[PDB]
Design a protein around this ligand. Structure first.
Ligand SMILES: N[C@@H](CC(=O)O)C(=O)O
Ligand SMILES: N[C@@H](CC(=O)O)C(=O)O
Ligand code: NA
Ligand code: NA
Ligand code: NA
Ligand code: NA
Lengths: 411, 411
């Protein structure tokens, strides 16, 4: 019945509108009314967007690992990793350098005096690794499990490939029937990801409707100071790092955001990298990148490369050490970077688990969570949370896409 | 080996000493060190003093109610009742009127905006009263239950009395044997409360050792203002109301405080009205009050009459609303008073359950505990808490003694 107004109009139309409906209804104390009446529409959006992730990631990866060289996954990968880490590491120091320039937390006097302690630590690495190799891939699918799905689809595509250069040309028949139908699916899902996305307008209005009602109010004083240093910091990653890394790798910076937003805007309002993926992937395809690349740099990036989390993780770690007057200085400044990289790689792909991860990075330096004023300050951040989360996610994703496009213009 | 230096010299000697040991050890980050090594001495003290409560309350209340008129119990009770309420109600207004005088919370900016909600409420009165009637008095003794014990000793004493006025003079013999031996106990316990109390010097050193270690450092900025306004507010409940209500009822104010400290320094350091009681009761006896009074106005005021708690509960509910900028004004000002009374009468007799109770009084007004900045501020308060609790408990008990002395000077 629009009939069809263009999507990046209606999407950008509901965003700036529900942000104002949300802020008005929120600051006039209705946020519960908003979480009753509006919310479930901003839910249905993310609902449909999830529904696809499991097929579209599995299907697209079988195909894409079939239609690329085992040699080249293994190069594109080592590329994306050493690119992913480097971007993540930069975003922390670009966060420290924003909480140094701004000063959130300082000017709330609240010091405390006990640590470390002792303390503990050790990411069980061995177990996280053995874990990407699933033991029932039907299983893996059947309940979320994207990383172990990846490592199957990659193993499968590689084996089908091998089936096609085999002597007996009965199996190459089967090998095709499979890989055709698998592509049948993948392709289908990219059609559904357009379906939803005509819902996006509504879903986007009704998401920042709720996120702005129930947490805009908290953006105040020293908390407001944490927003600005984070926001001005994230939109300094975009410009100082991506556009530069796109310009340098000779892919058009402004045509790149021209690919979009779609995934830039579903990342923002959903605050779910995993829920974004379908849209994130359909703007990899639609921008021409190769499937044997994008269907493995994007589902890995959707978890491992959260530049926006490990930035707020930088500047939040500063706020809570500022509010206690604990000056962190040389050694810790450097062990924030390391651990907030860690903490984001790290974080899960869903809403504010980055904030829950923020605990791992605090404990890394002095302050331990148990001390009331520690926690008092953390609580405060846990009220400005979903407001940070929006921008955090939109860069956690935009760094995945630039990671993809810049690796694939080298391959 | 002292051999025996004076107690009110060594009691007052450790307090100013350990509070400097504590603060020096604390701010140098050792609070754990002090809770590992010091603390258990502070404990032993409260261990011993508790050991006595159950007998000394029961034993003395059987006696004193046998040694007074059912008539008189009747009058003293209702006297102390509308006395305690009257004191409790004033302390809140003396609190508000301190948090209005200072300004704790204002100057920390952090507003919030959902309520009420809905909300709930209703102390199950029916059940609390029905409860003062125990169903195994042996039981009630054998596990804490001081209020149900009270109601037994009171009915036991009156029944004994009655047996001494009965025709058969075999029963007046048994009635004597009993009441005698019962007083045997009571008397005994009052000798034991002296035992311990020669330990108190150590006990007192080793309690503020830790409380000051583990919380002193939190007394800073906006929190430091909440302390001062409670503290200067508490020592203004002492002069303005007690010394005036002692002066007015023909009992010497400085010779009242001379009675002590004993119960005044067991109250402060332990932060347990219940734990204090033996020293609170032997300061009733040792100051000449009649058993059939004090042995029923102390174990009752020990729970019901908590002026100091309902004083901080007023000035803490202000802090949290002031840090949110939510101004409370006419009707709330008055529905703090009723509720912070309720909350203290209310509170249990043990350390910082008043700080937990502070919730009830927060809920009564607008702010709900679910909102991060509510909980953010409350947390801060939960870090200055046993520092408040000290002064709090010393005036929960001081008003229990003035409530006894001025009622028995009228009986
Ligand atoms: N919800 C975020 C994680 C975070 O930063 O809290 C994401 O999808 O990237
Ligand atoms: N600790 C206090 C109770 C309170 O005010 O928290 C008492 O024993 O009376
Ligand atoms: Na991501
Ligand atoms: Na992550
Ligand atoms: Na009391
Ligand atoms: Na009480």
């Amino acid at each position: 019945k629009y009939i069809e107004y263009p999507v990046l109009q209606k999407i950008l139309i509901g965003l700036i509108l529900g942000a104002i409906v949300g802020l008005i209804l929120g600051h006039y104390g209705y946020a519960h009314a908003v979480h009753t009446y509006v919310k479930p529409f901003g839910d249905l959006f993310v609902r449909l967007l999830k529904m696809l992730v499991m097929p579209i990631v599995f299907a697209s990866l079988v195909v894409g690992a079939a239609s690329i060289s085992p040699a080249r996954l293994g190069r594109v990968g080592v590329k994306i990793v050493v690119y992913y880490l480097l971007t993540s590491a930069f975003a922390v120091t670009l966060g420290i350098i924003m909480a140094r320039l701004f000063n959130p937390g300082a000017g709330i006097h609240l010091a405390v005096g006990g640590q470390q302690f002792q303390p503990k630590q050790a990411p069980p690495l061995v177990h996280i690794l053995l874990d990407i190799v699933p033991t029932n891939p039907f299983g893996a699918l059947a309940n979320g499990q994207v990383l172990p799905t990846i490592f199957f689809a990659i193993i499968l595509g590689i084996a089908i490939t091998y089936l096609m250069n085999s002597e007996n040309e009965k199996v190459r028949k089967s090998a095709e029937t499979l890989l055709d139908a698998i592509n049948g699916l993948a392709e289908a899902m990219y059609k559904i990801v357009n379906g939803v996305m005509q819902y996006a307008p509504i879903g986007v209005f009704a998401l920042i409707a709720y996120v702005m009602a129930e947490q805009g109010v908290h953006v105040v004083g020293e908390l407001a100071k944490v927003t600005a240093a984070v926001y001005v910091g994230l939109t300094l990653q975009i410009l100082l790092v991506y556009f530069v890394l796109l310009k340098i790798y000779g892919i058009d910076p402004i045509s790149f955001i021209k690919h979009a937003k779609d995934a830039m805007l579903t990342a923002f309002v959903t605050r779910s990298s995993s829920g974004t993926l379908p849209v994130t992937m359909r703007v990899a395809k639609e921008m021409g990148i190769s499937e044997g690349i994008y269907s493995f740099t994007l589902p890995l990036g959707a978890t491992i490369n959260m530049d926006g989390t490990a930035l707020y993780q930088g500047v939040c770690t500063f706020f809570i050490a500022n509010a206690l007057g604990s000056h962190l200085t040389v050694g810790q400044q450097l062990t924030i970077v390391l651990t907030a990289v860690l903490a984001s790689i790290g974080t899960a792909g869903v809403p504010g688990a980055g904030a829950i991860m923020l605990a791992m990075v605090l404990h890394s330096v002095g302050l331990p969570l148990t001390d009331p004023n520690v926690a008092a300050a953390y609580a405060m951040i846990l009220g400005i949370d979903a407001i940070l989360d929006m921008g955090a996610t939109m860069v956690n994703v935009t760094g995945d896409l630039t990671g993809t496009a810049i690796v694939a213009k080298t391959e």
